[PDB]
Each structure stands twice: as C-alpha cells, then as structure tokens.
Amino acid sequence: AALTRDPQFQKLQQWYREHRSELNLRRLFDANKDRFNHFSLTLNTNHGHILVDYSKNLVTEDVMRMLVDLAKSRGVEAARERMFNGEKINYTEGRAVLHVALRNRSNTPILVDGKDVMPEVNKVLDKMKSFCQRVRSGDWKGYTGKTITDVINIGIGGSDLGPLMVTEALKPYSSGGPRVWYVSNIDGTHIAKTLAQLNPESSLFIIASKTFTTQETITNAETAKEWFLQAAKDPSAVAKHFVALSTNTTKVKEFGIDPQNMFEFWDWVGGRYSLWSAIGLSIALHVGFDNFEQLLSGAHWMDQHFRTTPLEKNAPVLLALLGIWYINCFGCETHAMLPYDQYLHRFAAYFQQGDMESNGKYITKSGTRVDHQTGPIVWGEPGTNGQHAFYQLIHQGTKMIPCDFLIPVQTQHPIRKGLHHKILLANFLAQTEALMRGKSTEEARKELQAAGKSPEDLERLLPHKVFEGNRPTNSIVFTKLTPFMLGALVAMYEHKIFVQGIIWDINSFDQWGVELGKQLAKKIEPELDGSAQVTSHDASTNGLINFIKQQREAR
Amino acid sequence: AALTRDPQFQKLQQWYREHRSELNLRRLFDANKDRFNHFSLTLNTNHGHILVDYSKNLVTEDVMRMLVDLAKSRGVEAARERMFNGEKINYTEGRAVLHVALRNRSNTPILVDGKDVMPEVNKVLDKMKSFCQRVRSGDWKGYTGKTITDVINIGIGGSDLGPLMVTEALKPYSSGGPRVWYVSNIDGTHIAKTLAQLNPESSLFIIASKTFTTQETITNAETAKEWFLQAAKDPSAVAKHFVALSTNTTKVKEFGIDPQNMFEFWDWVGGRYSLWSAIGLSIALHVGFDNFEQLLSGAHWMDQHFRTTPLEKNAPVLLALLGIWYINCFGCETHAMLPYDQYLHRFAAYFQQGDMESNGKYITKSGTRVDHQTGPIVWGEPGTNGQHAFYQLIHQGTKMIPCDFLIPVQTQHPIRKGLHHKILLANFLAQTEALMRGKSTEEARKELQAAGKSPEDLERLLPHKVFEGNRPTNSIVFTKLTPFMLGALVAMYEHKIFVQGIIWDINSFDQWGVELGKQLAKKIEPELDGSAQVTSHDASTNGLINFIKQQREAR
Numbered sequence A, B: 001a002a003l004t005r006d007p008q009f010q011k012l013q014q015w016y017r018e019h020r021s022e023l024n025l026r027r028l029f030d031a032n033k034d035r036f037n038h039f040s041l042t043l044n045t046n047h048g049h050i051l052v053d054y055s056k057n058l059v060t061e062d063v064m065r066m067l068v069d070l071a072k073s074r075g076v077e078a079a080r081e082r083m084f085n086g087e088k089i090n091y092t093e094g095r096a097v098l099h100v101a102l103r104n105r106s107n108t109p110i111l112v113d114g115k116d117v118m119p120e121v122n123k124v125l126d127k128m129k130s131f132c133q134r135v136r137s138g139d140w141k142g143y144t145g146k147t148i149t150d151v152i153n154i155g156i157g158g159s160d161l162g163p164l165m166v167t168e169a170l171k172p173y174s175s176g177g178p179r180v181w182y183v184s185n186i187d188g189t190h191i192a193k194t195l196a197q198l199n200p201e202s203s204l205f206i207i208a209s210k211t212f213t214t215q216e217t218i219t220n221a222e223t224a225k226e227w228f229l230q231a232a233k234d235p236s237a238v239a240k241h242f243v244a245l246s247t248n249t250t251k252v253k254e255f256g257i258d259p260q261n262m263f264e265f266w267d268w269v270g271g272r273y274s275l276w277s278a279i280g281l282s283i284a285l286h287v288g289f290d291n292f293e294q295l296l297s298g299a300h301w302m303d304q305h306f307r308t309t310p311l312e313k314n315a316p317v318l319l320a321l322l323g324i325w326y327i328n329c330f331g332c333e334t335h336a337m338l339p340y341d342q343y344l345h346r347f348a349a350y351f352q353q354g355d356m357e358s359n360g361k362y363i364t365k366s367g368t369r370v371d372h373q374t375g376p377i378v379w380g381e382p383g384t385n386g387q388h389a390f391y392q393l394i395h396q397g398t399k400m401i402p403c404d405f406l407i408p409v410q411t412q413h414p415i416r417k418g419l420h421h422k423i424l425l426a427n428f429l430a431q432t433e434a435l436m437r438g439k440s441t442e443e444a445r446k447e448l449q450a451a452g453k454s455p456e457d458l459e460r461l462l463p464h465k466v467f468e469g470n471r472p473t474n475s476i477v478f479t480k481l482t483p484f485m486l487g488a489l490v491a492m493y494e495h496k497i498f499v500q501g502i503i504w505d506i507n508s509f510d511q512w513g514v515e516l517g518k519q520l521a522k523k524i525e526p527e528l529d530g531s532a533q534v535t536s537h538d539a540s541t542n543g544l545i546n547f548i549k550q551q552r553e554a555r
C-alpha cells in the first residue's frame, strides 16, 4: 500500500512510537498559552463564522506539521484539482466526481468528456425552481382540483438520508410548505403507516432513484401508485401526483411517470453526495427554492475554501488529518459526531453513511490490499441526551473515541429569554473540558472527604469516581444553523472524507459492497415462496429459512 | 484484574493465539452439517418462538465449551442469583438491582433490606392501571372538560429512551390511545416545536425523573408548566394536566405536582432499566394497560429463562459469551444491532445507552483497573436501509464488526399479499450469508468475464469487486413483534449486558460518568452571562466561550 510506503507516514509513525507518552492535554494546555490560537481555525463565510477548534487534540506543532507534510506527499492538492476539473477519479466505475458542480453557483465551465456539465445542472435547477413555486403557491392542483399539502419522497440510501437530514435540520424554514415524508425501507410498515395518513387528492409522490431499478424504491413506488390509482382510477392523473429524480429516462417512462415530470441528474453524482442535485427536490419543496439555493451556496463557499486555501489552514484537510492521526497511529476504530442541536438529530446518521460508505475500503488505486486501517465507524446522537447515555463509556471505558462536538451559537427558538440555549452551550463546553482534564484519584478523594464519607466508604467508592481524562475532541461552533451554514458544514465533511480517502489511496466514490447488496437477495427471494424446506445453502441460511416458514403458520 | 487472572480466560486466550487462523466460516460450515443445529438455540415462550442462531460465528464446539467454562469460573450463576434475590450488587451506590422485580408477575417475595418490594411494585401498577383507563376512556377531563388527546413525556436518558423505543415499536397497538411525544433535550427546539402543536386543554404532561433534579427535565418541565398556566391561569388546573414518575416525593411536591399524581419507583431501578416501572406510564397510556402487562410478562418469561436454564443453552449468556470472544480475543471495539423492522428504528439506540452506559467501565469490584477491554461501542440502523450505507464498510472495510441481525417472521402490515415482508426477509437472510462467504478473486473474475469485460477492464476492476467475507453475525428471528415478545427481547439483552459485566468484574449498574455530567455544567453556565471575556479555564474553553459571546451579537 502507498500509505505505508510513504516517508512522511513512517516519520509520523516513528514519532508516535517515540512520544505518545508525552501527549497529555492538561500539560499541553498549561505549557502553551497560545494553544487555542495555534490549534484553531476561523472561517468567515460572510453568512456566519465557523470555529474549528481542534486544540483539545493529542497533537503538537510538530505533528500537525508532519500531518500536513503527509498531505502534500500523498498528493492531496492535485487529487483535489482532479475532482474539481471533472476527471474520472472514480476509476472503478470510470466516472467523474462532481457533487461540487451541482452547487457551482459561479458557473465556471466544468468539463466531463469535454462537455460543460453546467448548462444541464442549471437547466434542472430552473426546472426545480419552477415546479417548487407552482406546488408551493397552489397553482399545481391534484386530480380533484385541490392543492398539495403532502410531499412524499420514496427512495432509499443516498436517495433518502440527505433530503431527510436537511429538511429535518431546516424545519424552521418550512413555513408555507407542504409536509414531507420519507419512505425508504422495503418494510411494509414504512409505506403503510405513511399512506394511512394521506389523502391521494393532495399528496405528491417523488420517486428518488438514480438507476430507477432499486428493489425497495420501485416496490414502494408501485405500492404508492396502486394505492393512488385505487382512488383516482385514472392513469392520466399520475402525471399530477408522481415525479421522478433519476438519471434513467427510459426506466422512468416505463414505470408510468411522464418525462416532463423527470428532474434529472448524472452518473457523476454519487448517491451519498446527491442532496445538492434534483434528489434534493423534497428540500426545495419544503423550505422553498431560495433556501435550496442558499444551501448550495454554503456548500459552494466551502468548496472554494477547500480548493484555494493552503493545507496548513484548510478546514476539511485538518479534520481529515486529525482523523488519520487517530486512525493510523492511535488505532481508534470509531469517530463520533455529536451535534448539540435537536434539528440535527439525523446529522450523525447522514455522515455514518457518507463517511463509512465512502471510505470503508481495503483496495488501493493499484489494486493492492491496504495493510493499514481505513474509514472509521461513525456514530452519534444529539447533545445533551448522549451525556446521559453513551458518554459514560467515552468517559470511563477502555476505548479511545475522537469526538466532534457541534453547535449553533444562535438557536432557532430562543425561548425563555435564552435559558435553554445557555444551558445547552454550557453543557457543550464542559464535556470537552471534562473529557480533557478528567478527575484524578486525589481530586476524587478530596471531594469524597468533603462530602463527609467515612474512611471505608471513601476507600471502596473512590477509584470508581476517578476519571483519567485525556480524551480528545473537536469543537465546531458556527453562528447559526441556516440553510447556508448547513450547506457549508455538510460540504466540509464531504471534503474531510475526500482528503482521508486520497491519503489512504482508496476510491472514496464507489461502493461495491452496496452494489453487491443490490443483487444478493435474488436467490433467497423465490425460495421463501412455498412450503418446501430449503436445503441449497449453508446450514444457517437453510435453518433460518425453515424457521421462518415454520413460523409463517403460527397464530 | 480478575478476568486476566482467570485460568479459563488464559486457556481461552492461548487457544485463540493458536487457532484464530483455522476459523473460517465457509470451511466450518461445509465440514459439519449439523452446524446450525449445534450452534443455535430455540425459545418457545408460548407467545412466540425466538431463534437465536449464532452459527455464523467464528467459534467451534471447543470455544463455546471454553466460553461456558469461563462463565462458571467467573461465578455468573451466583452473581445472577444475587441480583434476583435483591442483594445490593450495585456496590458503589450500595443499591440492589431489581428491574426484574418490576415485572415479577409471579409475585414471589423479593427482599430489599428485609422487606418485600412486591406489594409496592403492584400498588404502583394498579395505580397506573386505574389512571390509564380513566385517561384513555375519556373519564379524565382537562381543565375545560375536554378529553386528553396528547400525552407528553418530559424526561431525558433512562427517563426517555425506553418509553420512546417501546411506543415506537408497539405503534400498531395504540388504537384508541392519545398521541405520545418525547421531549428530552434541553435544546429549546425540543420543547418549543412540541408545544407549538399542542392545545393545553387536552395535553397531559408527565415528568419522568428519578431524582426530580435533572437540569434538563426540570427546565423543560417548568417551561411546559408556564406555557400551561399562561393558558389555564389556575394553579389548581395543574393537577389535571401534570403527573410525575419519580422516587422523590418532596421534590415532586415542591415543583407543584400533587402527591396523588405521583407514580413512584425505587432506587434499585436503574434508569437505563426503568421502562418496566412507572417510567413506562407513557407506554401504558399509548397502547393500553393490558399491553403494558404483556410487555412485562415477556420480560418476566425471559427472566425465568435467564435464571433457571443451564449456561450451555442460556440465550443471554451465550450472546454475552460470543461478545466476550470478539471483545477480549479478537479485539473488536464495536457491536452492531441491526433490526430489520421499521418499528424498531430506535431499538439499537436504546441499547446504545443500555449497553455502553452499563458496561463502559474500567474499575473492578476490587477497585483495581482493568487491563483488558470492556463494553463495546454499540450502534446500528434498521434494515434494509443500512445495506445501502454503512454495510459497505462492514463488507469491505478494515474493521471486524460482530452484527446482530433481528427480525419478525410476521409483520404488522402484510400489505401486497406479503410482498414487502418477503423481500425484507430475503435481504435479511442474504446479508449474513454474504457477510459470511464473501466473494473470492476467482468468483469476481468469473463474473466479470461473463459480463464481457476486457482483459484490461477486468484487471483493473476485479480486486475492487472482491469480498473477503468471514464476517460473523447473529440472527435473532422471532414470531412476531408483539408487546410480549418485545418485552422478552429487551430483557434478553439486559441479561446479556449483565453476564458480560460479571465476567469483566465491573459494576454494570452505576454510571459515574453520567453522574458527573450532571454536575459539570455549573461553572460555565453563569460565565456565559454578561459580555466579559472568560479567562478562568484552559485556552480552549475560554476561546470557545469568547467566540460564543462574539457571535451572540451577529445578525
């Protein structure tokens, strides 16, 4: 693997072996008063500031330096330029990677196979703009002359999670917009529980599918259609309640949706990167089109930052580099994303797919197997809730778990003269502080004594109340969570993923494990039909199938 | 640490060192046709069967044997009996651990400090039964003579997640019940967005708090109260819309809720184990009291199974033991819980708190530090969604990730003559199959050729389409997800956690990291007030506070 062969990587690894023991946050902070100044970055977007404070990390000036040196040596700069220029850097599918073109508000020409993709990106935006206005204003009428009150996205994965995370996070901006629902799972529960609350006369279904062949989506889609036709009984009415977000025109047509109702996208738009395309129609419908444009601008701003900023102060790069430090040196398997914002309750889950699906790889550009770790397991829940649950382990377990703590300075709901937000912020600041400094035997002993504990009550209890601390975290604090800022934060991590991907020399933009999952279920499916016992697999798959069948009958 | 000193543990570890290389699922399956029979367990509860198939694990008869031997040597049996007898096994708080008494339908006497806790457990159930009937039937009227249509749980953590997970999962059983909302986070968004959709005339608030001092809950609670009094303007009306689930009577009274409106619980009920107590009132109100009783019976059944079944075929024990194998031998940091059921969309998250908060420890009963791993990082999302996102990493990453795949044989919504559920099941069966057998170079080469790929297209692509497989999983398939079965599945994992806890010699039932988080925010809080720069912390906490303040002003 390229990484391990890297001189800078080896230099980085030997230092780790030599100094890990000298990396103590308490000591690093008291020995350098400019530690926050030197290990923090500030982005003024003109639509809010973002503070990327990575000072509570197990790093010194020499590591960062080495980390940066490793970024150059691995060719992060040129690889980045390849993506922005539309070269086919998704070498296994032979595709370009241009989610950055979807939000290219500047409209500088971006070529794919010699042809500027921009005129078509904008043609689809206009189209989404025009449709959104009509639907939101009431001009667009359902089959009985009623306005749309409900918009239902049917799609799974990249055609689901993004639009879901964003509408959820931008909820406050949905005044005057129809309600949005996300049906993704093939589990009948998802479609049925949603349909039960809908009136066909005012519901609009959106079939979000790049290939338009994904089993789950097309099955949900057919069920939605049949439920709709049972009411409308007129196939011409479908053009009034069904639209498609796909790249496959023939498929859309064959399904029964009229080409005019197709909002198209391109093969260079990876699903886990598709919210900026037509796939984000649900968002535009919910919060309005201007807000959609604001979302893409924020990402556009972040793109410009990723693209022209020197590595030493490049937000996505530094975050990627700290992750490498913890992954390839400290050995941490996971990476937590803890947004202290109830509107971002799906943020971590969105990047669980974005990160893990992007960088959960073991094959390099040269086809050789990595002999190092790659993408981490990303998870998290919003603060403060997590403080009452899994933080126990982050504080007192046997795993190191790098954490990203995120939060808006301004809340959408400054109720009680800002009481709730102050408490939220205070909890936000103190966990990274505490995770950092912990609480020693003596500190715990002192307080126990003060509490009037007896020499023997104190002695048994004490060690259990001891915190070792030294647990690294990032604090990302932004002005306010508006459509613009949201777009920038998401695009920040997208690029974090990309830097780490290059450094590992893997393909961040294919997903053969997902591609395979989309073919795996074919044998089993028809074998579940009938009552015969199955015997054509391993004993486990056969044993499970036979239990399923035995249990089909029980009442 | 006790674990490492254990002869059976050492015997287990030496074998691992000697044979890990001989552990290949494909080979283990073709070399032993009774592999599913021997490495699977079946529980007939009389209200459904549960198949715990652990055959796709990296284990042989000799390991399990050793694993079981390790359970005996570590005294799992007697420690279990201690818990069921009500001894104070939460040695650091000096508390008993009797979540099993909350669902002790048998009513055999269970003593805490010599006194049977049962008469009081039942007194509170009756009380919840009586209240639920009144509220659900319409007999209980709001301050203007209207019936309750909305029940709002205010509580965080153990006083939140359980009731949330269960009502969500038992949604189909809520016919004739009021809607339920869960406000947990201090984030003003949570309370405000909920209150905006409520009419005070027909909303009932439940303040779920063991201590009744938790900052977030009491603040939400006060905000709820003020919003209610602004409408009702009569303090006597509070007795008609506010109830408490607490152990602290004085506090409840001091808050303004009338003692008759208190549903009490006890110190031996750990929050992450409290859904079976009064804390589950929301559930009983939503799905009805009989269903609540059904939930507790299922757990009661699982308790009996945990308690009287020989270790070799004890569900919780075996699951705990497989986890130890992967944690203390293979070194896996995480453990995934993948319910293929949209109703269980919070199941994994519930056990993220139950597991991690329980076993994220490093101090043993003797006060010495563990020199081995303990609780893992638990995460997951429902299937099939995950197959399109993070499975990419489980399939092709550089981490081993033990997975629990769960699913009902019978869905609550057999729409389309069972089409969706068959597809769901087929996807459920094939991922564990595929995770297991993977796809070799030759298999990928063969298919690529068949696809007419050119010698050079094939050659570059191939290695990327190669799956190494050998990724272990458990399949837990049950008859149908009813209140009863749900109760049994939850209680199964509760006991899994407990076995692993004993084996590690840690206290699964305290949570000083959470206890500490509940005190940490006091300095910061008043320092956020005002405009002065803060300088009384480390440079990071000061730098963040000062950015927060600078950004308070921006528009």
Ligand SMILES: O=C(O)[C@@H](O)[C@H](O)[C@H](O)COP(=O)(O)O
Binding pocket: A156, A157, A158, A159, A208, A209, A210, A211, A212, A213, A214, A217, A270, A271, A272, A357, A511, A514, B388, B389
């Ligand atoms: O990220 C991916 O590639 C997958 O999650 C796909 O987005 C998902 O399978 C949806 O596929 P499609 O949009 O082609 O229906």
Ligand SMILES: O=C(O)[C@@H](O)[C@H](O)[C@H](O)COP(=O)(O)O
Binding pocket: A388, A389, B156, B157, B158, B159, B208, B209, B210, B211, B212, B213, B214, B217, B270, B271, B272, B357, B511, B514
């Ligand atoms: O698990 C825990 O102990 C915590 O999550 C508590 O349940 C949480 O802090 C709620 O505390 P209380 O119920 O005392 O308000």
